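Annex B. Sample input.
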Amino acid sequence: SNALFGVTSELSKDGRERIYRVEGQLFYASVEDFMAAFDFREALDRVVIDVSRAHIWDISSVQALDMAVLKFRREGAEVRIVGMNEASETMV
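Annex B, continued. Sample output.
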């Protein structure tokens, strides 16, 4: 479900970088919805995934973030995560 989390994004003026902003609760039950939030095929030099406003609750949701990162990297982007420390405090 995407009831408990949201993803928005903003593209740079040159179209070369996209920042995704994730907010709310990330649980294993919503992994497929989380994946569907990203456009992995976009021609980008850089992707930022900002999870500073999100809470990761389980290791499946960590692995889903890692997979989104890997998929952007395989499509040629330099990828960085912002807010991992804050998002990871809930990983219980």
